[PDB]
Design a protein around this motif. Sequence first.
Motif, PDB file in Angstrom:
ATOM      1  N   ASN C  16       0.893  -1.152   0.000  1.00  0.00           N
ATOM      2  CA  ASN C  16       0.000   0.000   0.000  1.00  0.00           C
ATOM      3  C   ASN C  16       0.931   1.202   0.000  1.00  0.00           C
ATOM      4  O   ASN C  16       1.279   1.717   1.064  1.00  0.00           O
ATOM      5  CB  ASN C  16      -0.942   0.026   1.206  1.00  0.00           C
ATOM      6  CG  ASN C  16      -2.243  -0.693   0.951  1.00  0.00           C
ATOM      7  OD1 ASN C  16      -2.805  -0.600  -0.139  1.00  0.00           O
ATOM      8  ND2 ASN C  16      -2.735  -1.414   1.953  1.00  0.00           N
ATOM      9  N   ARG C  17       1.358   1.620  -1.192  1.00  0.00           N
ATOM     10  CA  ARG C  17       2.283   2.740  -1.312  1.00  0.00           C
ATOM     11  C   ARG C  17       1.524   4.019  -1.004  1.00  0.00           C
ATOM     12  O   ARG C  17       0.533   4.338  -1.668  1.00  0.00           O
ATOM     13  CB  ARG C  17       2.930   2.787  -2.691  1.00  0.00           C
ATOM     14  CG  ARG C  17       3.905   1.655  -2.949  1.00  0.00           C
ATOM     15  CD  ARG C  17       5.217   1.889  -2.226  1.00  0.00           C
ATOM     16  NE  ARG C  17       6.253   0.957  -2.660  1.00  0.00           N
ATOM     17  CZ  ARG C  17       7.485   0.935  -2.165  1.00  0.00           C
ATOM     18  NH1 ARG C  17       7.834   1.800  -1.225  1.00  0.00           N
ATOM     19  NH2 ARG C  17       8.367   0.052  -2.612  1.00  0.00           N
ATOM     20  N   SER C  18       1.990   4.753  -0.006  1.00  0.00           N
ATOM     21  CA  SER C  18       1.355   6.019   0.332  1.00  0.00           C
ATOM     22  C   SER C  18       1.859   7.152  -0.560  1.00  0.00           C
ATOM     23  O   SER C  18       2.566   6.936  -1.549  1.00  0.00           O
ATOM     24  CB  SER C  18       1.600   6.322   1.800  1.00  0.00           C
ATOM     25  OG  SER C  18       2.936   6.740   2.019  1.00  0.00           O
ATOM     26  N   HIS C  19       1.451   8.388  -0.230  1.00  0.00           N
ATOM     27  CA  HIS C  19       1.955   9.553  -0.951  1.00  0.00           C
ATOM     28  C   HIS C  19       3.424   9.787  -0.626  1.00  0.00           C
ATOM     29  O   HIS C  19       4.190  10.234  -1.487  1.00  0.00           O
ATOM     30  CB  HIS C  19       1.092  10.775  -0.608  1.00  0.00           C
ATOM     31  CG  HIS C  19       1.670  12.084  -1.053  1.00  0.00           C
ATOM     32  ND1 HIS C  19       1.475  12.588  -2.320  1.00  0.00           N
ATOM     33  CD2 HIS C  19       2.405  13.008  -0.389  1.00  0.00           C
ATOM     34  CE1 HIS C  19       2.083  13.757  -2.425  1.00  0.00           C
ATOM     35  NE2 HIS C  19       2.655  14.034  -1.267  1.00  0.00           N
ATOM     36  N   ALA C  20       3.835   9.464   0.602  1.00  0.00           N
ATOM     37  CA  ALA C  20       5.214   9.600   1.047  1.00  0.00           C
ATOM     38  C   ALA C  20       6.039   8.349   0.754  1.00  0.00           C
ATOM     39  O   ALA C  20       7.120   8.190   1.335  1.00  0.00           O
ATOM     40  CB  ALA C  20       5.251   9.904   2.544  1.00  0.00           C
ATOM     41  N   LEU C  21       5.493   7.437  -0.063  1.00  0.00           N
ATOM     42  CA  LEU C  21       6.062   6.182  -0.554  1.00  0.00           C
ATOM     43  C   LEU C  21       6.272   5.154   0.553  1.00  0.00           C
ATOM     44  O   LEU C  21       7.110   4.256   0.405  1.00  0.00           O
ATOM     45  CB  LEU C  21       7.349   6.396  -1.372  1.00  0.00           C
ATOM     46  CG  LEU C  21       7.124   7.108  -2.714  1.00  0.00           C
ATOM     47  CD1 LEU C  21       8.404   7.187  -3.519  1.00  0.00           C
ATOM     48  CD2 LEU C  21       6.031   6.428  -3.540  1.00  0.00           C
ATOM     49  N   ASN C  22       5.536   5.269   1.664  1.00  0.00           N
ATOM     50  CA  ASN C  22       5.567   4.246   2.703  1.00  0.00           C
ATOM     51  C   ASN C  22       4.896   2.979   2.205  1.00  0.00           C
ATOM     52  O   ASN C  22       3.806   3.037   1.625  1.00  0.00           O
ATOM     53  CB  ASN C  22       4.851   4.723   3.967  1.00  0.00           C
ATOM     54  CG  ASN C  22       5.561   5.858   4.659  1.00  0.00           C
ATOM     55  OD1 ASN C  22       4.929   6.794   5.122  1.00  0.00           O
ATOM     56  ND2 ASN C  22       6.868   5.749   4.796  1.00  0.00           N
TER      57      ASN C  22
END
Lengths: 94, 62, 77, 46, 103
Positions: C16-22
Amino acid sequence: MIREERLLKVLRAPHVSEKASTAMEKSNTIVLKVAKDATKAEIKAAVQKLFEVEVEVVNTLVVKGKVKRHGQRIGRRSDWKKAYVTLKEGQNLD
Amino acid sequence: KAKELREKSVEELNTELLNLLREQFNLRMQAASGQLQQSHLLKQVRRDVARVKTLLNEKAGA
Amino acid sequence: SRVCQVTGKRPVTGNNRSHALNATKRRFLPNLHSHRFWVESEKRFVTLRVSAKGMRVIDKKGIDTVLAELRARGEKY
Amino acid sequence: MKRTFQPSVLKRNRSHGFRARMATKNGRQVLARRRAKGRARLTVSK
Amino acid sequence: AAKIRRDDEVIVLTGKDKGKRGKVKNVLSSGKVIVEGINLVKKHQKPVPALNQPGGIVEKEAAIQVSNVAIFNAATGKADRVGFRFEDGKKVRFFKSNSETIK
RNA sequence: UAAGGUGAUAUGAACCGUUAUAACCGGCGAUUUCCGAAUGGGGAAACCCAGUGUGUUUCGACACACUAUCAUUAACUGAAUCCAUAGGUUAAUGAGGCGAACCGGGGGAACUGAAACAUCUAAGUACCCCGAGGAAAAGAAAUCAACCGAGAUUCCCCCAGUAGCGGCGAGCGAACGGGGAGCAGCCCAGAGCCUGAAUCAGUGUGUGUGUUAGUGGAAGCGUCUGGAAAGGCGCGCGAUACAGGGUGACAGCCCCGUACACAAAAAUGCACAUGCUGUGAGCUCGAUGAGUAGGGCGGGACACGUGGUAUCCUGUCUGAAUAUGGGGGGACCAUCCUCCAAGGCUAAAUACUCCUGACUGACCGAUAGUGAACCAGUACCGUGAGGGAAAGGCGAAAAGAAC
RNA sequence: AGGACCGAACCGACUAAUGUUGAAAAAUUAGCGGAUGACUUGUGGCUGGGGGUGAAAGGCCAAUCAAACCGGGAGAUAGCU
RNA sequence: CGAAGGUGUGCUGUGAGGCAUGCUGGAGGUAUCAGAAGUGCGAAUGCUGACAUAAGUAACGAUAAAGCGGGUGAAAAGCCCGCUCGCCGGAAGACCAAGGGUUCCUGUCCAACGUUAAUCGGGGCAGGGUGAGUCGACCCCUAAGGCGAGGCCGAAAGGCGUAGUCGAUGGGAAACAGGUUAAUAUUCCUGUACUUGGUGUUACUGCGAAGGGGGGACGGAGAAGGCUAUGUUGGCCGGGCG
RNA sequence: UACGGUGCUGAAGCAACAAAUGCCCUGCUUCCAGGAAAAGCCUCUAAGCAUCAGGUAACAUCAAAUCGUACCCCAAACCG
């Protein structure tokens, strides 16, 4: 009918002791050492056939082997079965 | 003893086995008390029973 | 389990790639639905747990060939 | 004072016995490890 | 395959009894023999009441390594080595010197 | 193979054998209690309790065989419900559990580095699970290259820490091409022509070579010191054998061996050759793997972190052309070149050693080398998973000290 | 009749003394509270670690608890001694 | 005709060191010139073993208590026997379950264990000792709960669960009194019983469950009445006249 | 008599009173918090068995296996 060869393996040795001699002379009961897996019927049949004596009743007990010490090594003696065979009245055995 | 025993029938082997077993029982009873002074006989009769049983399994069922 | 009987699809894993690439681990389950199919040849209903893509393959190929494939593949229905 | 070890052979066998270990996958792995290590007494059972 | 056997007469090659000869009493499984009256030791035999042994400073033979004795060749009066050969399909021993079969 | 044995601490007693069924070693058998996949039912492992059938019985009872679960195949039977299906019962075949490492797949961290930390790294590592084999996986281009050409897969050395990727930080890190080890190509999506024609697998027989016991195997004496000679001092001999070990101090010639030359009744491995069984070879014509390639959305693997990102896989929604066609050549288009995916099989080079045998060490010599030179995964600690020691040498020979 | 009263077994631990390399890694003596109840106890079982359980103190989970113990990543890292 | 190692002595170089030798030791050591390091120890509250120190000091574990004569022995305050004294006595007595596993009884021994001595012991060695149709387990039956054919669910491992099948701590058949062993006794012996299953003769006749009903089968407290175990007193019997 | 014990014989062996927390009592009275399951046991029949099998009454006979039984058990032997 229990097999003859099985009868020939049930009895191991006569048990010799003061209590055994007392029982033999007072209650007409011989103390035998029997196989650990022997039943009362097998012991009774084996004595009746091989020794030609009339058995009244057989009483058995399992004797636990003692834990001895040979020098420094701890060892345990083998467990054995003991049978009190009560011969009928008037019978005689060696 | 094996060679001499091999020219014998199944019933002969069985009666010989029974005689050996009775002999073994008498020897064992005799050795329990201090009467027996020939200790080698126990091993002897035991090996004889072993030979007869081996020959019985060899002849019957094969 | 969540396994399509026809196509063999099963839950896969991803992120689950976030906006901050987490990146946090997730799964992707197949769109499984239990559905009763009319087997005209045997004149009965056979209920299979299939995915939507599984339904599309049964429509295109015909129920008979799909059942033949299931039998060949050792699947029980 | 009541100490932590209050023995019971029934509880002992039911908790750490051979059949208890062989009932599940993880117990068999424990048994496998002990067999690889060469333990004389595999389980708590006498 | 053994070069030295029971009734062989052997001569001692090394040790305190070098030169003396005797008969082998019995051969031990450890590669040692007992030659009659050669390696005498004095054992302080303790008394034991059962079996009725008095107990004394007894003298008796002690074992000796097979590598220290060689077979005695009576003809030449010297030590010899043992070799093996087949005669009538039966393995026999022979003296290395004079190459005659050991009786 | 044998004149000596009945394994060790460990003597003693009673015996066996000496020219060959004493003992020892090896091949093939026979027996192989109970627990353990444990498999007739149960269970607190090494214990408790049966059912069916066939025999005996001196009627008290005994002996033997079968009876777990699941998968596939065949037969019988059989509901709601007419046929049927589901279910049930037999019979045959197979599987289950264990094992040190290697392999493929299904899941998958964090400590750490960035001098903090979240992208990133550690890392598809540690660990868990499934499956298989002596190797596994991959494999015969919808591959690269650049208008010249190469030709399956795998591994090694360069290319190269290069081109790139990256809070463009820490770090990650190819490929093209070249030199090697090894080299092998086929079959199904379908019919006719000749009919068993190459090859492979299984089972026999024959030959060679090993493996599981073994046989023969050279040549030294005198003297001095010494408890004892293999040492010192003379004079010899063997060597396809002066590797090694033992022997009263350092032995080529005292013993076991080594170099060399031989040996299998029986079992077995590997190359062959051949008999039998299954399997097909070659030619002509035909066909060219569809919910698939591609696309929208979210991830993952490619050195490539979505960046201008090609290529591969898919959880979700769709969706062709089909030889006059289609993929790729790092966004994308035209020209040109190369290949035919959506179906499989395949030896060798490659990785590892639980175990066996032979050999080697500028590897250790009892606080060292395995934790363990020694009755060690033992004693002991802990409910348990688990943790885990200390401890070697009389002497040449017990001649281990009679009195 | 009663989570009633006085008071033994039983359960608990309020005050003081001793003991603090103790007889004891929390106990002994003299007193003390409950003592038919929300009591106490024997046997067997169930709930597992970011989890349990708690008449609630972050208490307890094998003399260890603001995240048990054992094995592994692991010789973590340590601008510190 | 004495190697390495150990321990003194003498000589030598600026130094790490070196050389020779007396004694112990009893079988290996190694010049020179090169080569490779688990290459030099006083420290790390370093690790393992050994031995001091405090020190022959503290302590010798409930303030329930000992005194004497005789015996064994080399030796007796502690062991045995005898006479007094004291302590528990709803326990500090007796019997079990749980747990331990021969510690039980006899003979023998004091090196090590007992906080002292030790002839004694739960210490060492050897022998003996546990007798069941009725006691308990096994067996028939289930509770909480576990496992679970098929089954449903879950990336895999696996989770839950039906039919079943285990699981006592609860339900189910039957033995008491006396005597005896150094050590067993509701087990042995004597006397007197009781229960459940097969078979076999006679007499009688509707038998049969995986089904139905009854029963097993159930709470807390309180109050009398009848008893018994048991105790006191009287009578009786045996002994006594201090 | 081995001073440990062994052998032979043996009188009275009744009555009254008190009394349990044990038994009648798995009872009785009363209360709310409303108090296991299944088998053994008795009885009833369905398929089936038809003068067979079976059932219950007496008698006789046989069988009741296997394992534990020593010793400590409010402690010097269990947990510390």
